[PDB]
Amino acid sequence: SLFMSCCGMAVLLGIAVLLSSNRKAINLRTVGGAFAIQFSLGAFILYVPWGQELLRGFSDAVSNVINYGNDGTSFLFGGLVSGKMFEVFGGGGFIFAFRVLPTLIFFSALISVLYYLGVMQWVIRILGGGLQKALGTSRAESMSAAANIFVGQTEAPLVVRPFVPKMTQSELFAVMCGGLASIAGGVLAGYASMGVKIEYLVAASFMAAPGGLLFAKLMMPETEKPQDKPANVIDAAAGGASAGLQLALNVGAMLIAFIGLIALINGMLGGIGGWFGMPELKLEMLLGWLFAPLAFLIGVPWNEATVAGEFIGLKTVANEFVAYSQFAPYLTEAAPVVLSEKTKAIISFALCGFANLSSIAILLGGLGSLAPKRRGDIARMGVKAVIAGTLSNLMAATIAGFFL
Amino acid sequence: SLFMSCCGMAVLLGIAVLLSSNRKAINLRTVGGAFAIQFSLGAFILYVPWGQELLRGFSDAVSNVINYGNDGTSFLFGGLVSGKMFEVFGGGGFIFAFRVLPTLIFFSALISVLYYLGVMQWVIRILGGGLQKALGTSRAESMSAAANIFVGQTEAPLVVRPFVPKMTQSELFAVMCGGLASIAGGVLAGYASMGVKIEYLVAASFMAAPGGLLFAKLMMPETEKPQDKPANVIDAAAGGASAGLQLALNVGAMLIAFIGLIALINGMLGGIGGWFGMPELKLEMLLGWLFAPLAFLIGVPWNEATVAGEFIGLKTVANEFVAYSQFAPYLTEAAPVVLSEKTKAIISFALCGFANLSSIAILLGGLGSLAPKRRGDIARMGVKAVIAGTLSNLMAATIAGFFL
Amino acid sequence: SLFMSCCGMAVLLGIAVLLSSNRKAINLRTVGGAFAIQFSLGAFILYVPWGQELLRGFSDAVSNVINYGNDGTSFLFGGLVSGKMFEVFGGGGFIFAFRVLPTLIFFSALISVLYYLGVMQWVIRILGGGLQKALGTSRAESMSAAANIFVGQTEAPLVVRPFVPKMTQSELFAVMCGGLASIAGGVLAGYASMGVKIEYLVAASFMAAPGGLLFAKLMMPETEKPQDKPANVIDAAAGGASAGLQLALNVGAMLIAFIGLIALINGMLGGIGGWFGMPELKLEMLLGWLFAPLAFLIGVPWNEATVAGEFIGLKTVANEFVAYSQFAPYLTEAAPVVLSEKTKAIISFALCGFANLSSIAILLGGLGSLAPKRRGDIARMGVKAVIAGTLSNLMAATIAGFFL
Ligand SMILES: CCCCCCCCCCO[C@@H]1O[C@H](CO)[C@@H](O[C@H]2O[C@H](CO)[C@@H](O)[C@H](O)[C@H]2O)[C@H](O)[C@H]1O
Ligand SMILES: CCCCCCCCCCO[C@@H]1O[C@H](CO)[C@@H](O[C@H]2O[C@H](CO)[C@@H](O)[C@H](O)[C@H]2O)[C@H](O)[C@H]1O
Ligand SMILES: CCCCCCCCCCO[C@@H]1O[C@H](CO)[C@@H](O[C@H]2O[C@H](CO)[C@@H](O)[C@H](O)[C@H]2O)[C@H](O)[C@H]1O
Ligand SMILES: NC(=O)c1ncn([C@@H]2O[C@H](CO)[C@@H](O)[C@H]2O)n1
Ligand SMILES: NC(=O)c1ncn([C@@H]2O[C@H](CO)[C@@H](O)[C@H]2O)n1
Ligand SMILES: NC(=O)c1ncn([C@@H]2O[C@H](CO)[C@@H](O)[C@H]2O)n1
Ligand code: NA
Ligand code: NA
Ligand code: NA
């Protein structure tokens, strides 16, 4: 029952200790409180009545913003995003290119506006300051952890960019982990528009900040000594839309290619598998069979561990967007396999992160531009940082499955 | 009657004098003839029979070019831009993304071709030379004023780019105003494809050249002494299409975000307004209530000044494309408020310009690349140049409403 | 009969000799074997039974990859690329923007993956090595010729980029010709998705390598002495998709503008032609009337030479994509003119190449970045290289028409 989840949390923490750069340098106050906060945050908003109300209230607010933003895409694509599409094409009336991708553009503009007004910096300063006074983590890495709750792995460190070039290896590693353990507000609204429960997305986003610091300081403890704009609001929104546009185009092209490549791989795996008596062999079978123990470890029932492994594995070997795209049909009435409500939550939390190998190249470019003489350190800690981000997503999923 | 319009022209001229850098340095020949030309041009093509025929002939030619260009977008999007769309989705069959945006790509290619052939430079040389010999304005600033009739605020100064780095503050300011007082051929065809009368777009475009110089020399008189390519036609069209593509994407992303943001703002203004007994409070109400006196000043009837204020205000606080998008439904039979034919003309002329705050950032980049050591002067005169461009659009609207 | 084709091959070879930089420097072994290989390759896969089976087997494999890739675009655009589109919009249900353009993105990703795995370099090394040992051509120019079978004129020389800055004028010219005589894998799949027979596309692609070297060494014989990466497979696919996206957007914008411009030109040619009693005058008539002798020379029947001239001429004065777009309707049952199966093949082969004037500007940029001090030589040999690429496409078409 609940004993299997507590063992899951132990195993995840155990792997991080085994992969630590210095186990004897691990600060118990830091990693103790970091786990305590992520666990309590999960308890607060998933179990305790008052916390569940604050979570649904924030989620409904996010759901209202998305609909407001949908007026913009409704103007551009007219009846191609109306209800008539379902009357004509049925299930195929939901055009992803026009339904989900424009949301990335709107939310990028909105966040850019909330930065200009000082609203974002105000919230980050409070959350980031609460983390450092309770974990003993440095000023810059704590703000980046808080910033990552709302924005991407490359946009988050911008709040502390003059401190990035001279921050310690442990600090840089935590900044990398904070980004890999989290997503961004734009894609969050995208996944929400695909049927993923907003309550799970917001919850996983907030639990990412302490969870990112947790496995960052476990696998890479501090062994050194740390230290310590658009002309108007309309230009801010315009720049945000432009950034969101570029992101929308890149994500869309990636989904065409990656899903397309998977179909090719399944075609080849059908012929190759046939040589060994398994003509029905596909990529989903391999990933499911290989990630089932991991899925079972974090609280997924034995008879649903294989299916849950397909989604978790796909997120790791590719990215979470491709995973969410294959998992989204399982959140409707036309789902090929009816999953338990707890299993749906676990998959949602475990997927909610940028933790993949391809995000290292993005970290080399974005975070590397902020500190060109540190690109060597970024490339070196890349794989370890992905693992740390992965463990954070898995821990948040285990915690979520526990209180559910 | 016609006395209210003449007072409107006086007020607009009065504001420019009050905001002048040196009222005693204002050349009466310059600003006298500049107003005389813009007024006579309005009289010529809106009142006098022969002029009305030349205007409708040019407009029909423009209307034919758009339809020719529509073969290109018809090929790409097929039945999504056919008549069947109206039979299925009704009013929502008109897909803006495919109906209006591709036109920016085609017209950008066409203008780029007309530049290679020397046709554009031929027309600009004649118009620009007629302005300088009648106003005493310098060679470079006069050609830029003429060029702005057809192309954008960043593309226009390219005809005099080696003279830009060393031109006077008054010259640079006029170049900025010429761009803010006008639009570009590409978006012109876009607005025309949205239902805006081509006769009003072409008229406002041509009246922009003397109107731009008018308020430029009023608010910033000359106090110094002025001075004085693609391999083939197929490469020209290709480069133009590429430029138009980038423009199409940026405009589209902006419309998704801005309209989306407005819907969010109206949602918040509904809740905020409710605290003061006004739950129906929206952005359109604020802009209408605040710009109604201005609209009434330029010839809009008292019972239509509020609605006309919504569109004019929106163009100022954002951009003219967003304004035109909200005004376009009022040009159909399904209009929520039936406006007089004169009011429709006034709104069309007053909107027809790039005069907004966000265009300053664009002027810093485009016009700034032509003279990197002058970006300081551009940022300094930015706001004054927007005001001057705004007054030009308002003057052209007052003149248009007078002869109508 | 077959005597007219052999004369066609003679004429094409004759023109190249007349335009040679040094006829006395022409290596007979080189150009003899180069023609012998291109002719035998045509004989092998178009006439001989075993070769026809290898060609249809490779083509069916390519056809399967396209369908696999179509899962990606099906996900993005849903019912807009389903069969329901034909039930509602009829013929206009086939939306080019969603049916053809996404294929460029998928195939770019795939090729980028096959490069990372070493599969591409393996095939190129074998083909390129077979060409040099039989023609005496240098190492670098032979690999580039082989690489061009699969990728574009700018991507092909990347396999020998450190040898490009110091290769001879004859070597650089051949590298240019190898790209102009061929297309790329991405657009190949596009043309295939437009109804062009894959067997003809693959055949023309492979015959491009010896055909490119043939007319390169004919028009520019060697008179000097020659000499002699993404972190993971997922980053490779992502970079390929990004590149393919940029290509998709540029091609799409070009088709909107160029087709749009043609409609404008036909409108003007109707009015201009009317002055000389020919109001029905169009661009297709001019190109057909002017390229009919050329079409008749390469094996097109007298009563089909005019129509075939329209497509061949359009490919030359613009690009092969615009030509294929106008030729594609003639490959369906709703064709305005029913052409013989041999004529359809000849048009397909003669169009299958990047040989146009606009590709010179692309060669200046892409190939020029690999050797910035050689941009002068590229601009100088530009026109000659286009002619050489044109003659290669025409030769392959003559050979194809001969064995058919
Ligand atoms: C859509 C619905 C909501 C409506 C919102 C409309 C209100 C926006 C007002 C703009 O704010 C000002 O704009 C200036 C221009 O962008 C800025 O000046 C700055 O930039 C100018 C030009 O670059 C300079 O002249 C100034 O000195 C410099 O302070 C200035 O900082 C900024 O406060
Ligand atoms: C679609 C319907 C209408 C059909 C129109 C077709 C006609 C176009 C003809 C192209 O014109 C020439 O093209 C050359 C190549 O672009 C240019 O040469 C220039 O560029 C070459 C290569 O860059 C050099 O070799 C030359 O010396 C240099 O003068 C040259 O200036 C230009 O006049
Ligand atoms: C979608 C279905 C198919 C599933 C396929 C999944 C398998 C992919 C495995 C990735 O391969 C490795 O990834 C590393 C990271 O990209 C590379 O390390 C390189 O890059 C790292 C970070 O940049 C460094 O830490 C390493 O030392 C450096 O060798 C490494 O070369 C590469 O072999
Ligand atoms: N805003 C950002 O920084 C961002 N957004 C998306 N992605 C990348 O795109 C993938 C799919 O969302 C993720 O795994 C990230 O690596 N990065
Ligand atoms: N061609 C150009 O230079 C151009 N086109 C459009 N815009 C900008 O986009 C806004 C909407 O058209 C305008 O106010 C301009 O600031 N600039
Ligand atoms: N991959 C490439 O290098 C490429 N692809 C397309 N084109 C250019 O675009 C035109 C239409 O396909 C061709 O003639 C080329 O000049 N180049
Ligand atoms: Na983040
Ligand atoms: Na202009
Ligand atoms: Na090629």
Residue numbers in the entry:
A (entry chain A), B (entry chain A), C (entry chain A): 2 to 229, 241 to 416
From the paper:
The crystal structure of a CNT from Vibrio cholerae (vcCNT) presents the first opportunity to examine specific nucleoside recognition by CNTs from a structural perspective. vcCNT is an excellent model system to study hCNTs: it utilizes a Na+ gradient for nucleoside transport like hCNTs and shares high sequence identity (36–39%) with hCNTs with particularly high sequence identity for the nucleoside-binding site (64% with hCNT1, 73% with hCNT2, 91% with hCNT3). vcCNT forms a homotrimer with each protomer possessing its own nucleoside-binding site and permeation pathway.
To examine the structural basis of the reduced affinity, we solved the crystal structures of vcCNT-7C8C bound to adenosine and ribavirin. The structures reveal that the bulky purine base displaces the water observed in the uridine structure while maintaining similar modes of ribose binding, corroborating the idea that the reduced affinities of adenosine and ribavirin are due to the loss of the water-mediated interactions and highlighting the importance of the water coordinated by Thr 155 and Glu 156 in nucleoside recognition by CNTs.
